[PDB]
């Protein structure tokens, strides 16, 4: 009868034989995600985030999906942490070494407009250079504050942010993902069987995450 | 399998097949030497090697290898088979002891005297 009454079900018969012990029971085309098997996951995962947040760690919310991009920062950026609401680059968790390099020209690029150092070169030039910000500040603008690999990664849909999760389990960075019927939870060490979609499902839990994390460090 | 399936028909062994006609569980066997051949090796190698059919004391005939940089056997000389097959030479899974019976032994060899026919050189 609580807020957990918005992500009842999703993803039709495409499903995934693996995601079964979490299915309330198929009905009306698509199946349902047994919330009673979700209640423990509802906190068990959050508990660790709350616990790790106290260790002053790091948390990267991955949600390249449109219906989650613009609406993810308020839970990560505002809560001051880490997130990637766009095309997850190839290696921003493994080949970080060379990736961070991109972050630099992004930061120093920012300072350009900062002071009068922006009125340098032809008016056209500034434009050609400002475009880099659009891309940079977007694909990295919300990870720049990461001076080293995180300690735990919380990704929205376990399908879309596929590559994202991959690199993770290769570096030893725990992953808290809210999978789904057609999702492959075998890559998530902290499954949260919920509607990978639903404009409301995303917001509620997403914001709910930063909640525990916010005061996680007391 | 399962205990039941094992109680009935357990785990069978495997009769080890000892590639050697001159068995009799012996380190070596005496022969007579039928002739002295010079058959050619397999496909990978070349050069003609020396061999010879042997009429082992137990009747069991068989060709033995005559290793060494210098043969000296006859069509009647008595040699001693030892073992150790040879690849390049098929069917030739034996070697004539160097420096035994009515055979000879490598000449002028100063290395690995034990093997072949040599015992303390000219000093």
């Amino acid at each position: 009868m609580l807020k957990a009454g918005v992500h009842f079900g999703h993803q039709t018969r495409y499903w995934n034989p693996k995601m079964k012990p979490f299915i309330f029971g198929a009905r009306n085309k698509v199946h349902i995600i047994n919330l009673e098997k979700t209640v423990p996951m509802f906190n068990e995962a959050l508990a660790e985030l709350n616990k790790i947040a106290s260790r002053k760690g790091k948390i990267l919310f991955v949600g390249t999906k449109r219906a989650a991009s613009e609406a993810v920062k308020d839970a990560a950026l505002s809560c001051d942490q880490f997130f990637v609401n766009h095309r997850w680059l190839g290696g921003m968790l493994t080949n970080w070494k060379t990736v961070r390099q991109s972050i630099k020209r992004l930061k120093d690029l920012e300072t350009q407009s900062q002071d009068g150092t922006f009125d340098k070169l032809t008016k056209k030039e500034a434009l050609m250079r400002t475009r880099e910000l659009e891309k940079l500040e977007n694909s990295l603008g919300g990870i720049k504050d990461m001076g080293g690999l995180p300690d735990a990664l919380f990704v929205i849909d376990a399908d879309h942010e596929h590559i994202a999760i991959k690199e993770a389990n290769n570096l030893g960075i725990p992953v808290f993902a809210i999978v789904d019927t057609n999702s492959d939870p075998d890559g998530v060490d902290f499954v949260i069987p919920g509607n990978d979609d639903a404009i409301r499902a995303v917001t509620l839990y997403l914001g709910a995450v930063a909640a525990t994390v916010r005061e996680g460090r007391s | 399998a399962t205990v039941n399936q094992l109680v009935r028909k357990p785990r069978a062994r495997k009769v080890a097949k000892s590639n050697v006609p001159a068995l009799e569980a012996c380190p070596q066997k005496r022969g007579v030497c039928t002739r002295v051949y010079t058959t050619t090796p397999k496909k990978p190698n070349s050069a003609l090697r020396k061999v010879c059919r042997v009429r082992l004391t137990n009747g069991f005939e068989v060709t033995s290898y005559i290793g060494g940089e210098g043969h000296n056997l006859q069509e009647h000389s008595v040699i001693l088979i030892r073992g150790g097959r040879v690849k390049d030479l098929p069917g030739v899974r034996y070697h004539t002891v160097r420096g035994a019976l009515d055979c000879s032994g490598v000449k002028d060899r100063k290395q690995a005297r034990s093997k072949y026919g040599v015992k303390r050189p000219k000093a």
Partner: protein, 129 residues
């Protein structure tokens, strides 16, 4: 199950753990509850109860320390067609001693240490690590 009611108990417990379940349920039995009683004191399970004066149904509560669960190892040994009976000087020692081993004695259900401390033996039941 219909042939191995005891072996089922363990499976239902381990299967529940993996699924991060809260509580496991299944038909009760003198030996079952008896076994369920041991793991209780052993801290492997929160609590446990039953329902039905004619139709008994066991009720166990899974357990977990941190991100992972507690009972991360539970297997059987003395199953039908291949039963196991050890002495007071053969009893196994799960995980070098950390894990427990349920064993039915002439005194009742006990653990590797329990029965040993007593000086008697019995039919091994299962290994819990």
């Amino acid at each position: 199950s219909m042939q191995d009611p005891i072996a089922d108990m363990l499976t239902r417990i381990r299967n529940g753990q993996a699924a991060n379940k809260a509580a496991v349920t299944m038909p009760s039995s003198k030996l079952k509850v008896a076994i369920a009683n041991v793991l209780k004191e052993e801290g492997f399970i929160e609590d446990f109860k039953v329902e039905g004066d004619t139709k008994p149904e066991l009720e166990l509560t899974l357990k977990y320390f941190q991100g992972k669960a507690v009972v991360e190892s539970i297997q059987r040994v003395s199953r039908p067609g291949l039963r196991i009976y050890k002495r007071k000087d053969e009893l196994p020692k799960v995980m070098a001693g950390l894990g427990i081993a349920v064993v039915s004695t002439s005194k009742g259900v006990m653990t590797d240490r329990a029965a040993r401390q007593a000086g008697l033996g019995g039919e091994i039941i299962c290994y819990v690590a």
